[PDB]
Symmetry: C2
Subunit: 262 residues, 2 copies
């Protein structure tokens, strides 16, 4: 609807199927979503993990070169500046195939990448074979009047990863994801706890339907600091649009003790 009074940030999340190894089709879908999100007044569009090439880790490692990653990356920058919308996407990192990670990047509405992050917690043996884990804490930056951060898929399942962002000041954590296997407890149990336990909002954007030998769950969601969904999708494809309204665990937490007990 109209932008509500008492809200200054309209976000969108793209939930859709990708086609393995078909970046032209996949980036056309993000372009379409970016257009529609912008026409609904969204200032940022969040897209799923590895959407550009599909969620196919071993094939990305075997058959997707750095040049082809770089090409898709340029095309996404163009979509951001071509549709006038901040964009969060996830592709492989920019190094060679056996040296790169899974990444998430944020570009502004002009087409300039402001933040990049490499997924620290890789999920399972195919992902661990195809990609190098990140070694750096999540970035936090001012955008749209709040502190944004990025994390990718399995990361958000570790309370330590979300705490790491929130400890650096994150207020909205944007998470591209690719979750299959009807794992309802990630969005239904963990996500809401991550928001409550840090007093933050998290946006989680998944694939949905059949892709690369799996069937993705959908279940894309924005969860606010009380742990309730501000908006959510089911299994069907969709563009979720949500307006963000304008115990102190972060201070109380005895970090000194808890850093040595992990």
């Amino acid at each position: 609807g109209l932008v509500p009074r008492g809200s200054h940030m309209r976000i969108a999340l793209m939930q859709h199927t990708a086609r393995p190894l078909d970046p032209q089709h996949n980036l056309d879908l993000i372009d379409d979503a970016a257009a529609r999100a912008s026409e609904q007044g969204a200032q940022l569009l969040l897209t799923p993990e590895l959407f550009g090439f599909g969620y196919v880790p071993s094939q990305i490692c075997a058959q997707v070169s750095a040049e082809q990653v770089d090409a898709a990356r340029s095309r996404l920058r163009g979509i951001a500046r071509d549709r006038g919308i901040a964009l969060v996407w996830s592709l492989p990192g920019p190094e060679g195939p056996e040296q790169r990670g899974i990444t998430a990047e944020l570009a502004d509405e002009h087409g300039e990448v402001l933040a990049s992050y490499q997924k620290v917690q890789l999920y399972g043996p195919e992902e661990k074979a195809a990609f190098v884990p990140g070694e750096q804490p999540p970035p936090v930056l001012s955008w749209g009047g709040r502190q944004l951060s990025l994390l990718v898929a399995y990361d958000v399942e570790f309370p330590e990863m979300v705490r790491a962002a929130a400890a650096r000041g994150a207020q909205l954590v944007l998470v591209p994801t690719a979750l299959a296997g009807d794992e309802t407890s990630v969005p239904g149990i963990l996500l809401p706890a991550r928001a409550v336990e840090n007093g933050i909002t998290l946006a989680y954007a998944n694939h949905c339907g059949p892709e690369g030998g799996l069937v993705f769950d959908g279940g894309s969601v924005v969860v606010g600091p009380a742990g309730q969904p501000l908006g959510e999708l089911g299994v069907e494809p969709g563009l979720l649009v949500v307006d963000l309204p304008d115990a102190d665990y972060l201070q109380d937490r005895r970090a000194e003790l808890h850093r040595n007990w992990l």
Copy 2:
């Protein structure tokens, strides 16, 4: 009912109102609960935080001496050995009033204390004025064929505290608590995440009804590793009895990185 085949551990949780500064009445209630739990075949009874004296931090600090704490502690050991049931209780620690913490202790069915723990995360200014925070990680010990640990009330709200126990091998974490103010997200959102994110079972035993200027929530619950309640109470007093049946976050977690990012 009868002990089910495929279960070798029957636990009980006491949810009730305590009377401030009346340990004779309060310990009679734990004694009754310990009898009834034992007659239902439970091997352990979990009781709420500071039940013995009621949840009245400033009055405990002002008016409850170490001798009176020690007296209640002896009486609880006697209940364990008098009713033939392992008992988890929470009283003030044994030092002087301005030196002691909030503690939880486990005694076996014979009347011998096997573990003690001092609450690390104190909740709010009255608790922080009345008690000294603990400095030690939660204990873990074999009992009844699994690894047990202890945490108290606000502790379990920090994913770091539960991780600390689970990292030392805890499989069942027993938590006396005192939660008021209709804070439904502790048992409804955090508790289930703590179980899922560590692949453990947690038992949480609260006060209920009016006590010491507050009205306690009840909501006592046992949550297993999939995050579902094995059993739960509402607001009314009760003795919850439950039989425990007989992603690898604990291994995958990059602790080295996450210890420096907190």
